[PDB]
């Protein structure tokens, strides 16, 4: 497998975190994967020409859709789930939740599961 690490990028500030040395702050494989996941979610699909069709999501386009609330909930689940699962490190994403806190303004949760989160059987002959 041998996934590799990457460099931090504070999405709050929209800038790379760099040490006092001036070198960019490296970080772990798992940290890099979490960094990647948020970026892929925020990248719309088919539009940013640098990436292929695999990368990116389509959540923004769903806003203009005329589908009902429940239909939009399933589409959110499908879109987020499809976008994340392309990464090798993903094991499973699910347990989605939704809260239409206002009449038409939504908050939703979902839980991601890594490859390392798997449970291993203990036996040998």
């Amino acid at each position: 497998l041998d996934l590799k690490g990457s460099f931090l990028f504070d999405f709050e500030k929209g800038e790379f975190v760099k040490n006092a040395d001036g070198t960019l702050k490296k970080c772990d494989k798992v940290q890099a994967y979490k960094q990647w996941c948020q970026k892929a979610i925020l990248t719309p699909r088919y539009k940013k020409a640098a990436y292929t069709n695999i990368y990116g999501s389509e959540i923004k386009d769903l806003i203009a859709s005329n589908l009902s609330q429940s239909a939009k909930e399933l589409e959110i689940t499908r879109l987020i789930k499809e976008t994340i699962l392309v990464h090798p490190y993903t094991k499973e994403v699910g347990e989605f939740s939704f809260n239409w806190l206002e009449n038409s303004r939504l908050v939703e949760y979902e839980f991601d599961v890594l490859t390392i989160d798997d449970e291993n059987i203990v036996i040998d002959g």
């Binding site: 460099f7 790379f16 760099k18 040395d21 001036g22 070198t23 960019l24």
Partner: protein, 94 residues
């Protein structure tokens, strides 16, 4: 054969391209092993390679002084020159 005296700016070194690449940065480590150095070096490699292999070779094959293939034959054609063709050997069997 004749050599085409290409201008220097059309034959920049990779490192010179890379050095000019790093000139813009001001408050980030531009040392080797850094993101800035490591990420920009392949660009300098391709830019220099395209400049040399792309433009100079493209310019070279344009002129007959530095053409080799069908491009040379086309250039020879334009001024009426045609490459001589092979022929069969011949003789007598007793």
């Amino acid at each position: 054969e004749r050599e085409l005296p290409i201008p220097v700016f059309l034959t920049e070194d990779e490192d010179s391209v890379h050095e000019r690449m790093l000139s813009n940065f001001q408050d980030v480590s531009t040392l080797e092993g850094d993101f800035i150095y490591d990420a920009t070096r392949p660009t300098a490699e391709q830019i220099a390679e395209l400049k040399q292999l792309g433009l100079q070779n493209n310019l070279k094959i344009a002129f007959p002084q530095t053409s080799y293939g069908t491009y040379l034959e086309w250039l020879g054609e334009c001024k009426g020159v045609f490459k001589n063709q092979p022929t069969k050997a011949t003789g007598v069997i007793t």
